[PDB]
Design a binder for this molecule. Structure first.
Ligand SMILES: O=C(O)[C@@H]1C=CC(=O)N1C[C@@H](O)[C@@H](O)[C@H](O)[C@H](O)CO
Length: 316
């Protein structure tokens, strides 16, 4: 049994606040287990922890390119499907080393006072459009936005033309104030320290709810899948499977979407929600046609080479 906290690593800020309300606190109440949310999730951190042999994280939230790299390096425990019992979660989300629990869009957002007529992906990469820009911390999401912004059709994205994408970012690189994580981006929006960003739909909508006079579009947006995974050598690997089972059920999945504008993988969650929530999701036909879906197969094969270039690229 659990004699200490079940440690869950995520992204912090409003998204972790949402996960705590929908998954962490309800599981703690249902199981009697102490659940502690932490930050730092990512492939580099998971690798360092697992390879050290000093594993302090029991459950991780992994975005599909980070998840792909973790699987490739044998950093995760296989999911116990005798424990994770969710026939209403499509089999393609129920993978060997992780369970797809959320579908999320990454969108172009603008401050309405600086840009009342909005910003298109073409205008984001236009040197003549003046404004403090924030791009994501890694090459993932960033490269696809640069390419769609430069006129690459969403259907023609992969294999990513990395050279072109970087030459595209090069046009507005002097106006890019940072390459930040989701929590840092939401704080910059709320503090009015940026004018144009590329961030998670839920982070944008939560900043607006909190008073940020910002807007966004689905033009050049990138949709991705978020996974629950268990680091290899996790001290509470068996309890982690019990948390994952709980979290992927219709009620916790619907509670997540209620608080933050990210979509469920459980097919029975949306009928529990306001019909209007469907319009703020990447799968919505009017939204889907304007952007693309991240290809994790491409990132699985190309992440290491792209990362080696990206690190040197953002270090000027
Ligand atoms: O935390 C969020 O609201 C969103 C929703 C899931 C997710 O992975 N998020 C983070 C990404 O949008 C992004 O911040 C990413 O981790 C970095 O760009 C590093 O690749």
């Amino acid at each position: 049994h659990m004699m200490a906290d079940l440690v869950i690593s995520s992204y912090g800020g409003s998204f972790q606040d949402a996960q705590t309300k929908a998954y962490f606190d309800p599981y703690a109440k249902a199981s009697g287990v102490k659940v502690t949310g932490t930050t730092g999730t990512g492939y580099a951190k998971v690798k360092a922890m697992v390879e050290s042999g000093n594993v302090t994280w029991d459950v991780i939230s992994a975005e599909s390119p980070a998840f792909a790299s973790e699987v490739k390096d044998g950093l995760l425990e296989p999911i116990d499907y005798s424990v994770v019992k969710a026939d209403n979660v499509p089999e393609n989300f129920r993978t060997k080393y992780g369970v797809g629990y959320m579908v999320f869009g990454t969108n172009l957002a603008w401050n309405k006072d600086k840009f009342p007529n909005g910003v298109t992906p073409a205008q984001f990469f236009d040197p003549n459009v003046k404004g403090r820009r924030v791009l994501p911390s890694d090459a993932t999401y960033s490269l696809e936005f640069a390419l769609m912004g430069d006129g690459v059709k969403p259907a023609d994205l992969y294999p990513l033309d990395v050279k072109r994408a970087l030459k595209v970012i090069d046009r507005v690189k002097d106006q890019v104030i940072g390459y930040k994580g989701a929590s840092d981006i939401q704080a910059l929006m709320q503090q009015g320290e940026a004018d144009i960003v590329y961030a998670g739909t839920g982070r944008i909508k939560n900043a607006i709810k909190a008073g940020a006079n910002w807007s966004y579009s689905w033009e050049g947006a990138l949709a991705d899948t978020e996974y629950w995974a268990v680091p290899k050598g996790a001290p509470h690997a068996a309890e982690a499977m019990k948390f994952i089972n709980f979290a992927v059920q219709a009620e916790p999945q619907a509670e997540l979407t209620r608080v933050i504008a990210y979509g469920p993988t459980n097919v029975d969650a949306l009928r529990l929600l306001d019909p209007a929530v469907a319009k703020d999701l990447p799968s919505y036909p009017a939204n889907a046609k304007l952007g693309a879906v991240l290809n994790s197969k491409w990132w699985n094969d190309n992440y290491d080479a792209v990362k080696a270039e990206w690190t040197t690229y953002i270090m000027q």
